Amino acid sequence: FLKQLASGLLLVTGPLVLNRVPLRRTHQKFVIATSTKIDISNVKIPKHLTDAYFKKKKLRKPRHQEGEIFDTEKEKYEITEQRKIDQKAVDSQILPKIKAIPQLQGYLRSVFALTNGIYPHKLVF
Amino acid sequence: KTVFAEHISDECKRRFYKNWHKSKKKAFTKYCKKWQDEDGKKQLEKDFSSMKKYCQVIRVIAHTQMRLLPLRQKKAHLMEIQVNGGTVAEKLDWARERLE
Amino acid sequence: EVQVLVLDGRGHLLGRLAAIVAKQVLLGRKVVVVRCEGINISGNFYRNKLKYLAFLRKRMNTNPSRGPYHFRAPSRIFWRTVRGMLPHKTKRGQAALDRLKVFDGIPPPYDKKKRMVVPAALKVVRLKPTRKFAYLGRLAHEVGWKYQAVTATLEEKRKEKAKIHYRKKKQLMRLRKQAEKNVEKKIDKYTEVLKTHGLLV
Amino acid sequence: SHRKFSAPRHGSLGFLPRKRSSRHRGKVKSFPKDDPSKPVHLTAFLGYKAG
Amino acid sequence: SGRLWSKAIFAGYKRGLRNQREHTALLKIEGVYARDETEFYLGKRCAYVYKAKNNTVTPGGKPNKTRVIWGKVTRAHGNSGMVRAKFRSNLPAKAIGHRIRVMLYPSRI
Amino acid sequence: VFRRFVEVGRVAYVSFGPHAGKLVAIVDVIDQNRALVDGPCTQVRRQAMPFKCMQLTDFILKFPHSAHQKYVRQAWQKADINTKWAATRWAKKIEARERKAKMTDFDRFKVMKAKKMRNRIIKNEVKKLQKAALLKASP
RNA sequence: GGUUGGCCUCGGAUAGCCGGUCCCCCGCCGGGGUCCGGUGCGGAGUGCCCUUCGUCCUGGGAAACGGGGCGCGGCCGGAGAGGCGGCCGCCCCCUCGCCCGUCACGCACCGCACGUUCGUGGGGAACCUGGCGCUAAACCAUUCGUAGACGACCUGCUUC
RNA sequence: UGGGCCACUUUUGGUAAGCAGAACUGGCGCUGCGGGAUGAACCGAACGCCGGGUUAAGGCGCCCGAUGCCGACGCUCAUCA
RNA sequence: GCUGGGAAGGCCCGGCGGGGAAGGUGGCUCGGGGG
Ligand SMILES: [Mg+2]
Ligand SMILES: [Mg+2]
Ligand SMILES: [Mg+2]
Ligand SMILES: [Mg+2]
Ligand SMILES: [Mg+2]
Ligand SMILES: [Mg+2]
Ligand SMILES: [Mg+2]
Ligand SMILES: [Mg+2]
Ligand SMILES: [Mg+2]
Ligand SMILES: [Mg+2]
C-alpha cells in the first residue's frame, strides 16, 4: 500500500516483478490489512498519480449510430509508456526496501488461500 | 466361488435351458476349455486354493440321472449337497476327487 | 464438512450418539458409524432387554407382516434410533437418513481409516462410574441377532492385522526420531523457526 | 363377549402362507451341523417317489 | 489458486416451531461454534452458487450454467455460532443442507 | 495411584474463569467444591474458587492453613514458583500454544517454508536409514 | 448436478495411561520382568502432511545411493462389502524441480460478482478411427398333467 | 335475539358425574394468532398489507427455532423410574 | 457520586503489649518407619 487517493481509493503496487500487480487502485473494503509492513517513508510517489490519472478511458459510437459494422476494435487496452515509466520509478525505490527483510519477496510472490483447516475469524493477519 | 467340472452331461445341461429343443446347447462350452488350457488350469488351482483359505462350508452340486428313470422328463435335477465332517481342505480334496 | 465422518461406536451411549449423528446428517454431512455392537445403553442389562422385549410385543394384531419391523442387528437398532430423531416421512428427512451408513464390526472400506469419537456421547464422561449399562451387542444377540459370534471372530482377526500395522507405524516413528537426531546441524535452522512460532516445543 | 365354550383353533399358523410353493424340487433349508471330527460325508440325496 | 471463502451450510429458515419466515436464513459456518466467534462474519457477503440447465451471462467471462443468489450475514443466531442471512431472493428449500460461501468481501480487518 | 492432592500449599493452575491462565496456591478448603485461594505473586487476590477450574501442579508450598497473604507470598518467593513453573514442560506447552495463536500471515508463510525444508531433509534421512537397514544377509 | 487439498487403520484404560531400552522364552520378531522418560496427553486430531503465480539469467545450501513415466513385464498382500495397496526387472527422460539469494520478463486488460478444484465427473444416444474377440436366448404357439378358476407351474419336440 | 355453554371463586340437590340448579367477573358462542404434541373455553395476546427491532406465555439433546454455558448446589436407581 | 462519608484487604518483620485458644508449630512422650 502506498497512499490513499482523493476519492478514498487505495493506491497499491505489489511490485510488477513480484506478482504482476501494477500501480493500481483498489477499494479498502475489499482488502485485508496484514500486520506486516515496510517503512516506505521517504519514497516519492509522483504527484500526477491521481484518480484522474487512473480513471478508465473509453470512446465508442460518437459518429456511429446503427451497430452493424463492428466497433469491437480498440478493445485491447494498451499500457502507456507513461505508466511504464511511473511503474519503474516507484518500483526502483520500493524493491530495495522489500529485499531488506528476509523472504518478504517470496511472501509477496505467493497468494493467499484458505486451507480446509484454517478459519479467517481465528487468523491473525 | 463355484467351480464346475469338465464334461457336464446333457441331462444336467438341460436344467440350464427353458427350451432345450430350440437351444444350441452352448452351456459351459467356453468354461470347459479352461480345464485344458494352461492359464485356465492355473486359474482353477487358484480358485481351489482360495476356497481352502477362505471358505468355511463347502457343498457339491450334484444332479440326478433322468435316463435311468421311467419318467417322461429328461431334464436332470440339480442340488447343492453339503459336505460335512472334516477340515475345509479335507472336504475340498474329497469333492475334487469326486468330481464327475 | 465435505468428507465422510466415520465414528467408532464402541463406548458411546445410544441416544446421545444418535442425536449427534441425526443433526450431522440433517446438516448435509455423510456419517458412517462402525462397530454398532460396542454401543452402550445406560441402565442395567435386564432393564434394557425388557425395553426391547416390550418393543417386540408391539405388532399389528391384524397383520404382523405389516406391523412394526423389529430389526435385531445392533447396526439396524442404532439406525432405527437415528430414524426416530429424523423427520423420516419428508423428502429432506429421507435424504438425511440416506446419508447414514451403519455397520456391525468394521468392514474393509473403513477398517483402514481413522475413526472419530464423540466425547459428548461417550459413556466414560456421560455416565457415573457407579451406574450400570448394557452392551448393544449382547442385547441384540439375546433378542435375536444371529451373527454375534462371526462378527467377534472377524473383529479379532481385524485387530491382529491392526496390531501389525501399529507395530510398523511405531517402527517408522522410531526411525524418524533417529533421523531427526541424525541430521541436526542441517535442521536446527528451521527447527529454530518452528520453535519461535510455537510449533515443535 | 367371550366365546361360550373353548375350542382349539383350526390349523397351524406355523405353515401360514398357504401358497403354491415357489419351487418344485424342495430345498433343504438346514443341513446338519458340521463337526470336523467325523469322516467326510455327504448330507443329502435326491430320489423319486415310486409308490 | 485458493478457496478464499468460508464454508457455510444452509441450515434452514428463521422459524418458530410451526411458522416459517422464509425471507431470512440460518447458516452454520464451519469452525464457528460460539456466539462470540460470529463477530468476524457480520455483514460479510454470502452466496448460494448452483448450476442450472440453460446458460446465463457471467460477469467477466463467457456464459456458463452457474447461477448465484447473493446475500449477506445480518446478525448472530443463538449461542452456537449460527448466523442469519438475508438474500436478494429467498433461498430455495432445495438448498437446505448445501453449501453457502462467505466471501470476506466487505472486510473490516 | 494418585500423585497430586488438594492440600494447603498446593499450587494450582487456573484453567478457566476470570483468572484463567494464572497460578494460585490453595490456602484452605471449604465444602468439597471450593477452596480459599490466594496467588499473591500472580495477581490473584484471596477468594473462593471451585475445584472444577483448577488443575493441580507439582509444586507444594509450606505455610499453615488460612495464614495471611504476607506468609503465602514469602513462601511463594522463597523457592520461587514463578521461575520453577516457567521451566516446566507444561508452561512451555502453554507458551507454544499462545505464540502459535498469535502467528501472523507472514509468520505462517515463513513457518510453511521452514517446515517444508525440514520435512524434506528428515524424510531423505529416513529413506537412507531404511535402505541401510534393508541390507540384511544373515543366518 | 454436487463439490472447491489430504490424513493409508493399535488395542483399549479411565481409582489410570503412552513411549523407549537391557535380561528370559517364542523361530531373526513379538510377549514378560527390570530400568528410563512423558502425562492437563507435544510420539499432541486444539494434531499431522501437502502447500499452486510461471519462466529466464544466476550463486550458495539439500541432495546427488535423486525425481517423472495413463511405458512395458513379473511378483506379493488384501475375502467381511477383497473393486484396493505394495515390491521388483528392463527401458525413456531432465539433473530441473526443496530452502535462502542474483536477475528481469509474461495483456500491467486501467477498483468490482459466478474466479480457484474434484474433472479426462455421472448418464444417454450418434460419427469417425485402430487392434483383439463372440455368434445366444427368452416368450408365444404346440405338448405334458407331478399343476390348474384364468394366469402361473412341472414337462417333451431328427442323438448312440 | 329471547335453546346457551365454559373457567376461578362462593354455592344448593346428589355417592358422584363431562350431572342438575344459582351468585360474581371473564370468556367461548361471534375469535384468528403464540404456547399447552393434539383440543370451542386453559396460559399469553386479540387481528388492515409489509420491513426492522423486542418481548409475553412457553421453551432451548434430535424431531424442532433456541444452552454446542468447561452453568451452581443437592436428591434419586425403579426386574411397572 | 453514595455507602458504616463502603466492608474487607496490601505494605510499614507495626510497634509497647494484654488476652483467647485449636483444624496444635516446635519441643516432649508413646507407637510404626529410612544407615
Ligand atoms: Mg351446570
Ligand atoms: Mg348460535
Ligand atoms: Mg364480543
Ligand atoms: Mg379469541
Ligand atoms: Mg396454538
Ligand atoms: Mg397435553
Ligand atoms: Mg416482526
Ligand atoms: Mg418444545
Ligand atoms: Mg436446533
Ligand atoms: Mg409407582
From Swiss-Prot, chain A:
Domain of life: Eukaryota
Any one Gene Ontology cellular component term annotated for this protein: cytoplasm
One example GO MF annotation: RNA binding
GO biological process, one term: cytoplasmic translation
Major localization listed first in the record, in broad terms: cytoplasm
Modified residue annotations for N6-acetyllysine: K76
Keywords, sorted A to Z: Acetylation, Cytoplasm, Endoplasmic reticulum, Isopeptide bond, Phosphoprotein, Ribonucleoprotein, Ribosomal protein, Ubl conjugation
Residues with PTM N6-succinyllysine: K44
Subcellular localization: Cytoplasm, Cytosol; Cytoplasm; Rough endoplasmic reticulum
Keyword Transmembrane helix on entry: no
Family: Belongs to the eukaryotic ribosomal protein eL6 family.
The protein's assembly and partners: Component of the large ribosomal subunit. May bind IPO9 with low affinity.
Described function: Component of the large ribosomal subunit. The ribosome is a large ribonucleoprotein complex responsible for the synthesis of proteins in the cell. (Microbial infection) Specifically binds to domain C of the Tax-responsive enhancer element in the long terminal repeat of HTLV-I.
Protein name according to UniProt: Large ribosomal subunit protein eL6
Species classification: Eukaryota, Metazoa, Chordata, Craniata, Vertebrata
Gene: RPL6
Shown segment, full-protein numbering: 164 to 288 of 288
Curated annotation (Swiss-Prot), chain B:
Subcellular location: Nucleus, Nucleolus; Cytoplasm
Recorded superkingdom: Eukaryota
Location of N6-acetyllysine modifications: K34
PTM remark: It is not required for incorporation of RPL3 into ribosomes.
Subunit structure of this chain's protein: Component of the large ribosomal subunit. Interacts with DHX33.
Protein function: Component of the large ribosomal subunit. The ribosome is a large ribonucleoprotein complex responsible for the synthesis of proteins in the cell.
Family: Belongs to the universal ribosomal protein uL3 family.
Protein name: Large ribosomal subunit protein uL3
Species of provenance: Homo sapiens (Human)
Swiss-Prot record, chain E:
Keywords: Acetylation, Cytoplasm, Diamond-Blackfan anemia, Disease variant, Ribonucleoprotein, Ribosomal protein, RNA-binding, tRNA-binding
InterPro entries, A to Z: Ribosomal_eL33, Ribosomal_eL33_CS, Ribosomal_eL33_sf, Transl_B-barrel_sf
GO biological process: cytoplasmic translation; ribosomal large subunit biogenesis; rRNA processing; translation
A Gene Ontology term for the protein's cellular component: cytosol
Organism: Homo sapiens (Human)
The keyword Cell cycle belongs to this UniProt entry's keyword annotation: no
Keyword Ribosomal protein tagged: yes
Family assignment from sequence similarity: Belongs to the eukaryotic ribosomal protein eL33 family.
Subunit-level organization: Component of the large ribosomal subunit.
SUPFAM superfamilies documented for this protein: Translation proteins
Function per UniProt: Component of the large ribosomal subunit. The ribosome is a large ribonucleoprotein complex responsible for the synthesis of proteins in the cell. Required for the proliferation and viability of hematopoietic cells.
Disease implication from the record: Diamond-Blackfan anemia 5: A form of Diamond-Blackfan anemia, a congenital non-regenerative hypoplastic anemia that usually presents early in infancy. Diamond-Blackfan anemia is characterized by a moderate to severe macrocytic anemia, erythroblastopenia, and an increased risk of malignancy. 30 to 40% of Diamond-Blackfan anemia patients present with short stature and congenital anomalies, the most frequent being craniofacial (Pierre-Robin syndrome and cleft palate), thumb and urogenital anomalies.
Localization annotation: Cytoplasm
Entries under HAMAP family matching the protein: Ribosomal_eL33
Any coiled-coil regions, as ranges: none
N6-acetyllysine: modified positions: K7, K62
Annotated protein name in UniProt: Large ribosomal subunit protein eL33
PTM sites of type N6-succinyllysine: K62
Classification via Pfam families: Ribosomal_L35Ae
From Swiss-Prot, chain F:
Purpose of the protein: Component of the large ribosomal subunit. The ribosome is a large ribonucleoprotein complex responsible for the synthesis of proteins in the cell.
GO BP: cytoplasmic translation; ribosomal large subunit biogenesis; rRNA processing; translation
The keyword Acetylation is assigned to this record: yes
Modified residues (N6-succinyllysine): K84
Residues modified to N6-acetyllysine: K78, K84
Subcellular location: Cytoplasm
Subunit structure: Component of the large ribosomal subunit.
Gene: RPL14
Protein name (record): Large ribosomal subunit protein eL14
Positions bearing Phosphoserine: S138
Keyword Membrane: no
Taxonomic superkingdom: Eukaryota
UniProt-recorded Gene Ontology molecular function terms: cadherin binding; RNA binding; structural constituent of ribosome
Cross-link (Glycyl lysine isopeptide (Lys-Gly) (interchain with G-Cter in SUMO2)): K123
Keywords attached to this entry: Acetylation, Cytoplasm, Isopeptide bond, Phosphoprotein, Repeat, Ribonucleoprotein, Ribosomal protein, Ubl conjugation
Protein family (similarity comment): Belongs to the eukaryotic ribosomal protein eL14 family.
GO cellular component: cytoplasm; cytosol; cytosolic large ribosomal subunit; cytosolic ribosome; extracellular exosome; membrane; postsynaptic density
Organism encoding this protein: Homo sapiens (Human)
